[PDB]
Scaffold this motif. Structure first.
Motif, PDB file in Angstrom:
ATOM      1  N   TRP A  21      60.358  55.184  56.623  1.00  0.00           N
ATOM      2  CA  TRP A  21      60.537  55.606  58.014  1.00  0.00           C
ATOM      3  C   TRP A  21      61.729  54.319  58.693  1.00  0.00           C
ATOM      4  O   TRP A  21      62.416  54.987  60.421  1.00  0.00           O
ATOM      5  N   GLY A  22      61.533  53.367  58.322  1.00  0.00           N
ATOM      6  CA  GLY A  22      62.524  52.541  58.830  1.00  0.00           C
ATOM      7  C   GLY A  22      62.088  51.581  60.249  1.00  0.00           C
ATOM      8  O   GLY A  22      63.085  51.600  61.359  1.00  0.00           O
ATOM      9  N   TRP A  23      60.748  51.303  59.672  1.00  0.00           N
ATOM     10  CA  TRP A  23      60.280  50.252  61.035  1.00  0.00           C
ATOM     11  C   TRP A  23      59.441  49.631  60.475  1.00  0.00           C
ATOM     12  O   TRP A  23      59.303  49.502  59.297  1.00  0.00           O
ATOM     13  N   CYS A  24      59.621  48.346  61.205  1.00  0.00           N
ATOM     14  CA  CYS A  24      58.864  47.342  60.308  1.00  0.00           C
ATOM     15  C   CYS A  24      57.153  47.082  60.592  1.00  0.00           C
ATOM     16  O   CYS A  24      56.544  47.115  61.228  1.00  0.00           O
ATOM     17  N   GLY A  25      56.727  46.150  59.371  1.00  0.00           N
ATOM     18  CA  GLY A  25      55.470  45.774  59.485  1.00  0.00           C
ATOM     19  C   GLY A  25      54.909  45.565  58.764  1.00  0.00           C
ATOM     20  O   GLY A  25      55.486  44.755  57.673  1.00  0.00           O
ATOM     21  N   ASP A  26      53.657  44.900  59.082  1.00  0.00           N
ATOM     22  CA  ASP A  26      53.052  44.198  57.588  1.00  0.00           C
ATOM     23  C   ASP A  26      51.645  44.491  57.045  1.00  0.00           C
ATOM     24  O   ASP A  26      51.285  43.791  56.673  1.00  0.00           O
ATOM     25  N   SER A  27      51.234  45.597  57.197  1.00  0.00           N
ATOM     26  CA  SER A  27      50.173  46.499  56.289  1.00  0.00           C
ATOM     27  C   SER A  27      50.693  47.539  55.753  1.00  0.00           C
ATOM     28  O   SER A  27      51.760  47.862  55.847  1.00  0.00           O
ATOM     29  N   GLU A  28      49.761  48.427  55.020  1.00  0.00           N
ATOM     30  CA  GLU A  28      49.599  48.821  53.867  1.00  0.00           C
ATOM     31  C   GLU A  28      51.228  49.993  53.891  1.00  0.00           C
ATOM     32  O   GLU A  28      51.817  50.009  52.794  1.00  0.00           O
ATOM     33  N   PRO A  29      51.198  50.433  55.281  1.00  0.00           N
ATOM     34  CA  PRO A  29      51.818  51.713  55.085  1.00  0.00           C
ATOM     35  C   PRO A  29      53.230  51.092  55.569  1.00  0.00           C
ATOM     36  O   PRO A  29      54.523  51.818  55.405  1.00  0.00           O
ATOM     37  N   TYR A  30      53.891  50.169  56.042  1.00  0.00           N
ATOM     38  CA  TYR A  30      54.776  49.375  55.537  1.00  0.00           C
ATOM     39  C   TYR A  30      55.563  48.354  54.813  1.00  0.00           C
ATOM     40  O   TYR A  30      56.161  48.716  53.569  1.00  0.00           O
ATOM     41  N   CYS A  31      54.534  47.916  53.962  1.00  0.00           N
ATOM     42  CA  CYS A  31      54.566  47.280  52.836  1.00  0.00           C
ATOM     43  C   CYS A  31      53.858  47.728  51.471  1.00  0.00           C
ATOM     44  O   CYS A  31      53.918  46.978  50.345  1.00  0.00           O
ATOM     45  N   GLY A  32      53.435  48.482  51.743  1.00  0.00           N
ATOM     46  CA  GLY A  32      52.541  49.479  50.315  1.00  0.00           C
ATOM     47  C   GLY A  32      53.474  50.142  49.510  1.00  0.00           C
ATOM     48  O   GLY A  32      54.481  50.123  48.837  1.00  0.00           O
ATOM     49  N   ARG A  33      52.942  51.631  49.399  1.00  0.00           N
ATOM     50  CA  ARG A  33      53.602  53.106  48.647  1.00  0.00           C
ATOM     51  C   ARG A  33      55.175  53.381  49.137  1.00  0.00           C
ATOM     52  O   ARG A  33      55.839  54.481  48.570  1.00  0.00           O
ATOM     53  N   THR A  34      54.111  53.054  50.628  1.00  0.00           N
ATOM     54  CA  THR A  34      55.389  53.461  51.417  1.00  0.00           C
ATOM     55  C   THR A  34      56.466  52.917  51.714  1.00  0.00           C
ATOM     56  O   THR A  34      57.102  52.871  52.903  1.00  0.00           O
ATOM     57  N   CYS A  35      56.624  51.800  51.182  1.00  0.00           N
ATOM     58  CA  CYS A  35      57.818  51.192  51.571  1.00  0.00           C
ATOM     59  C   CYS A  35      59.067  50.829  51.111  1.00  0.00           C
ATOM     60  O   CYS A  35      59.190  51.280  50.440  1.00  0.00           O
ATOM     61  N   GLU A  36      59.837  50.272  51.742  1.00  0.00           N
ATOM     62  CA  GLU A  36      61.418  50.905  51.459  1.00  0.00           C
ATOM     63  C   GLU A  36      61.913  48.911  50.783  1.00  0.00           C
ATOM     64  O   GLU A  36      63.174  49.335  49.278  1.00  0.00           O
ATOM     65  N   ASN A  37      61.712  47.777  51.864  1.00  0.00           N
ATOM     66  CA  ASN A  37      62.408  47.032  51.313  1.00  0.00           C
ATOM     67  C   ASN A  37      61.944  45.733  51.826  1.00  0.00           C
ATOM     68  O   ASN A  37      60.120  46.192  52.427  1.00  0.00           O
ATOM     69  N   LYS A  38      61.328  44.545  51.100  1.00  0.00           N
ATOM     70  CA  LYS A  38      60.937  43.870  51.101  1.00  0.00           C
ATOM     71  C   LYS A  38      58.941  43.664  51.423  1.00  0.00           C
ATOM     72  O   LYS A  38      58.205  43.234  52.040  1.00  0.00           O
ATOM     73  N   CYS A  39      59.114  43.922  50.172  1.00  0.00           N
ATOM     74  CA  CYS A  39      57.472  44.890  49.683  1.00  0.00           C
ATOM     75  C   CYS A  39      56.866  44.083  48.711  1.00  0.00           C
ATOM     76  O   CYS A  39      57.191  43.035  48.701  1.00  0.00           O
ATOM     77  N   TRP A  40      55.461  44.656  48.833  1.00  0.00           N
ATOM     78  CA  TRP A  40      53.788  43.557  48.067  1.00  0.00           C
ATOM     79  C   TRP A  40      54.698  44.166  47.210  1.00  0.00           C
ATOM     80  O   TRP A  40      54.848  42.105  46.145  1.00  0.00           O
ATOM     81  N   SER A  41      55.102  44.611  46.164  1.00  0.00           N
ATOM     82  CA  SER A  41      55.397  44.768  44.409  1.00  0.00           C
ATOM     83  C   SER A  41      56.829  44.499  44.315  1.00  0.00           C
ATOM     84  O   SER A  41      57.230  43.986  42.982  1.00  0.00           O
ATOM     85  N   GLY A  42      57.726  43.719  45.738  1.00  0.00           N
ATOM     86  CA  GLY A  42      58.514  42.591  44.833  1.00  0.00           C
ATOM     87  C   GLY A  42      58.423  41.234  44.917  1.00  0.00           C
ATOM     88  O   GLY A  42      59.597  40.151  44.959  1.00  0.00           O
ATOM     89  N   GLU A  43      57.390  40.754  45.003  1.00  0.00           N
ATOM     90  CA  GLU A  43      56.974  39.671  44.631  1.00  0.00           C
ATOM     91  C   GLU A  43      58.363  38.393  43.241  1.00  0.00           C
ATOM     92  O   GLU A  43      57.847  39.383  42.316  1.00  0.00           O
ATOM     93  N   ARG A  44      58.394  38.131  43.651  1.00  0.00           N
ATOM     94  CA  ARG A  44      58.822  37.261  42.380  1.00  0.00           C
ATOM     95  C   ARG A  44      57.489  37.457  41.349  1.00  0.00           C
ATOM     96  O   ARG A  44      57.073  36.936  41.477  1.00  0.00           O
ATOM     97  N   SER A  45      58.260  37.417  40.108  1.00  0.00           N
ATOM     98  CA  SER A  45      57.155  37.635  38.503  1.00  0.00           C
ATOM     99  C   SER A  45      57.243  35.649  38.563  1.00  0.00           C
ATOM    100  O   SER A  45      55.961  35.003  38.620  1.00  0.00           O
ATOM    101  N   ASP A  46      58.067  34.397  39.013  1.00  0.00           N
ATOM    102  CA  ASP A  46      57.666  32.932  39.184  1.00  0.00           C
ATOM    103  C   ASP A  46      57.263  32.864  40.712  1.00  0.00           C
ATOM    104  O   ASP A  46      56.703  31.324  41.277  1.00  0.00           O
TER     105      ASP A  46
END
Length: 86
Positions: A21-46
């Motif tokens: 929805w285009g807002w910044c934050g640090d909890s699940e709604p922002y970083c989890g399944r409903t994240c668009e960028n800089k998400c928890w799932s984006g950590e590099r494998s290294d």
């Protein structure tokens, strides 16, 4: 602040997650399944982070230390050891 496709195309200050929805934050709604960028799932494998690798995100409850690695706990998240997602 606003970010991403709904918010002008900017990255969040502090390298926080941008929700679909285009807002910044640090909890699940922002970083989890409903994240668009800089998400928890984006950590590099290294697990590297910081400017040398394009300021990628770290996963859930992980922080980017001043040494340039994602990790949990104090060596990574507290006081003067953390550079982003603290």
């Amino acid at each position: 602040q606003r970010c991403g496709s709904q918010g002008g195309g900017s990255t969040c200050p502090g390298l926080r997650c941008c929700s679909i929805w285009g807002w910044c934050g640090d909890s699940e709604p922002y970083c989890g399944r409903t994240c668009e960028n800089k998400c928890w799932s984006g950590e590099r494998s290294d697990h590297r982070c910081g400017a040398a690798v394009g300021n990628p995100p770290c996963g859930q409850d992980r922080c980017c230390s001043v040494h340039g690695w994602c990790g949990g706990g104090n060596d990574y998240c507290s006081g003067g050891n953390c550079q982003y997602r603290c």
